[PDB]
Write an enzyme that holds these catalytic residues in place. Structure first.
Site, PDB file in Angstrom:
ATOM      1  N   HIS A   1      22.684  -5.935 -21.321  1.00  0.00           N
ATOM      2  CA  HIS A   1      23.420  -5.346 -20.212  1.00  0.00           C
ATOM      3  C   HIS A   1      22.508  -4.591 -19.232  1.00  0.00           C
ATOM      4  O   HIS A   1      22.935  -4.247 -18.131  1.00  0.00           O
ATOM      5  CB  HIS A   1      24.581  -4.513 -20.733  1.00  0.00           C
ATOM      6  CG  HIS A   1      25.533  -4.090 -19.652  1.00  0.00           C
ATOM      7  ND1 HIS A   1      25.769  -4.783 -18.479  1.00  0.00           N
ATOM      8  CD2 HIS A   1      26.303  -2.975 -19.598  1.00  0.00           C
ATOM      9  CE1 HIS A   1      26.642  -4.093 -17.747  1.00  0.00           C
ATOM     10  NE2 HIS A   1      26.992  -2.993 -18.404  1.00  0.00           N
TER      11      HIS A   1
ATOM     12  N   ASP B   1      24.839  -8.083 -15.552  1.00  0.00           N
ATOM     13  CA  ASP B   1      25.965  -7.200 -15.302  1.00  0.00           C
ATOM     14  C   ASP B   1      27.287  -7.927 -15.596  1.00  0.00           C
ATOM     15  O   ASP B   1      27.368  -9.148 -15.499  1.00  0.00           O
ATOM     16  CB  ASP B   1      25.860  -6.677 -13.871  1.00  0.00           C
ATOM     17  CG  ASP B   1      24.490  -6.025 -13.575  1.00  0.00           C
ATOM     18  OD1 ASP B   1      23.854  -5.449 -14.487  1.00  0.00           O
ATOM     19  OD2 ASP B   1      24.099  -5.998 -12.391  1.00  0.00           O
TER      20      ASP B   1
END
Lengths: 228, 228, 228, 228
Positions: free
Chosen positions: C201, C205
């Protein structure tokens, strides 16, 4: 009175007829998959790219893949009195038809064997604009290695298209029609089109000629063959 | 570079085109009876004779019987600048196609009008072997009186076959396909094939040309006509 | 006792977990088209090429086309303490799994974004042989830009595959099952598979991550999208 | 190169992962009632108020009522090295997601437990405008007590959303799909969505975690439970 353009082109016809040998052979093919695929995505494609989708990238790309099996198609026959050499150059220049207000002209996509379907389609759209603008340079219409011609725009069952000398052969495209068909042991009704391959029987031999057209038939009838 | 074989044959094409007049006419025909008959007996025939049965004796024998009605077909046109004489010799030499590994060659059965169906079939099988052996003498391929050519082995709808000059005409054979058909006031599905007769319109007149093909159609569609 | 191979790899696991951020998201997809297509041609393909067809060129090619829309996927995050640079290099090296008799190893196809489906499939078959031969050089398994892993060979519903650090993400493939499905306003039964995308992450995104997987879903579910 | 925003947020990810314990559990739920209700009145509501109705007031209000049973959810865990105190403050600040053109940001409705469904919906619409205006003060995005995140806007089956430290937990929302379902002893087709609850297993205990999600399921599946 006939002008110079008429006189030149009119001569080139019966001249090229007397220069080459000449044969035409035929087949018909289901359009359903291509039509479905077109309808399913032409909008998405357009929004992603500014490009509308007809059928032309399909036929042409299929022709390229068939040529990649059958290089004989792309080569040209050269030297004095027809000469001595099958010119195996294997870049592929796709001549194709446009009807200007002053009649038929033939833009040529150079090096088309490199190209993606969408890119071919785009390239053709560019040329169509530039053609009706009269902006074309003569190098846009100096001969390619192969030719596809369309009568289906006017709409006919079948033509018998002319050898674009020095090219080996030409493919004609015709009206799509709904037709009765036998499929799956059943009578069905389907969008069908006939195809005509005209070829110089010097160096395009009957075996090869049939085999080429038949391979193309497959790629149209299942676009998934393009994935091979 | 083109070799002597290419140069000779390539010339003979457009030469013979410029020498003869030239026309092609067409029909399609039900294969069912012939197919049924073949399947019913090819094994018995083979055990009795060493001969496998295709279709070739059928087409050829039918052609002979049609020629026995229409002797114009067998004759050849001769003398200077095309000349002066329809040569009515009525022995029948059946030229036919074989594709060697080096491409197309044309064995000729001499005096075929004497022969039984099984014997024609056998004779052809002998020639096919001898052809791939390269044992053929040139007299095996010096011109006959008539020619049958096959594109159906590769598989096409329709060809437009070349005059084997000095012969009058040629018959093309094509792919058998299941096709939708109207028969007996009913839609049916049947094995069908198209036929193409190409002929020199010098001395093969449109009346005669059509009539010949149509008579052959009958003999194929009912083998019992061979009994007449 | 644990050997050096165990100790190294075991460390790399929880090390890479503590190095990257980490998220997994999911979807399931219809296998029918791909399965049909495979069955329809794997024999022809094999005879033309010596190459048998599984599914792997499909998934991988789809991934490449999705990457061609979403270059973020291919890039790697680099410098001290994770660093400072998203390395936008856009050649694509596809790491993939092989289980040797000594367990899991990861051959990498270099420059895969250039390749045809059939060629990818072939390339993988070559590597599989060379892998069980133990002939692989370490450069065959020095890290690529992306990774696909398969648990479906053993057969499971769903895994949660590990980040091949420094790569951004990994795709897991699972058992195909017949499953009840809602389609066309109807209950149907279909071959279905679940998919798991695990991603760092950092720089992948949630928007992008979902979007990537979903685009791939399309290419699997209609192979005709590969034609775009 | 990664900028300060990337570096800060990227650190916060694996930092918060290493700080909290972490677990995710799941369920799926019928959307029909909510969808029906929305369609039945969104126009009337809009004319009465200037407010359009999505789903968001529903999920959030349900969450509040579940929190009113399970105050453990709202509390935060605090002091040195994670510390010593479950902070039972029971005003509820609902953090939620917005994707600006520069990516993900998290507006927070303060004191949401006081609010009506329509008012929550309105408040969110105000924030969405102000967010794309870039007008937000940092106090609009200083941490709330709870978080709801949406992947369904992009459309996925299931995510695994990150703990918004110091908050206890987060709810993920996913794509609505028509799905085959067993209901009333019958196969049916229904709008369904999966739900993912991620929680710090420090102080959110497996019993409680499951119980919370399940209670929310009820409030969605019958909006009449909100009347209790």
């Amino acid at each position: 009175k006939m002008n110079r353009m008429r006189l030149r082109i009119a001569e080139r016809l019966k001249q090229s007829q007397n220069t080459a040998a000449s044969l035409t052979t035929f087949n018909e093919v289901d359009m359903s998959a291509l039509i479905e695929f077109r309808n399913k995505y032409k909008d998405e494609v357009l929004k992603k790219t500014g490009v509308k989708l007809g059928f032309m990238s399909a036929f042409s790309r299929a022709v390229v893949l068939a040529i990649r099996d059958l290089p004989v198609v792309n080569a040209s026959i050269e030297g004095p009195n027809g000469g001595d050499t099958i010119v195996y150059r294997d870049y592929v220049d796709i001549s194709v038809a446009v009807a200007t207000e002053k009649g038929l002209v033939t833009p040529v996509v150079r090096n088309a064997e490199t190209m993606d379907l969408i890119t071919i389609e785009k390239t053709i759209a560019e040329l169509g604009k530039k053609a009706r603008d009269g902006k074309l340079t003569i190098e846009d219409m100096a001969g390619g290695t192969f030719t596809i011609s369309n009568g289906g725009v006017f709409g006919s069952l079948m033509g018998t298209p002319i050898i674009n000398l020095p090219q080996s052969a030409v493919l004609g495209l015709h009206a799509i029609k709904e037709r009765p068909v036998a499929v799956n042991g059943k009578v069905e009704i389907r969008p069908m089109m006939y195809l005509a391959l005209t070829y110089d029987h010097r160096l395009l031999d009957g075996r090869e000629a049939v085999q080429f057209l038949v391979k193309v038939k497959e790629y149209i009838e299942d676009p998934r063959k393009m994935l091979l």
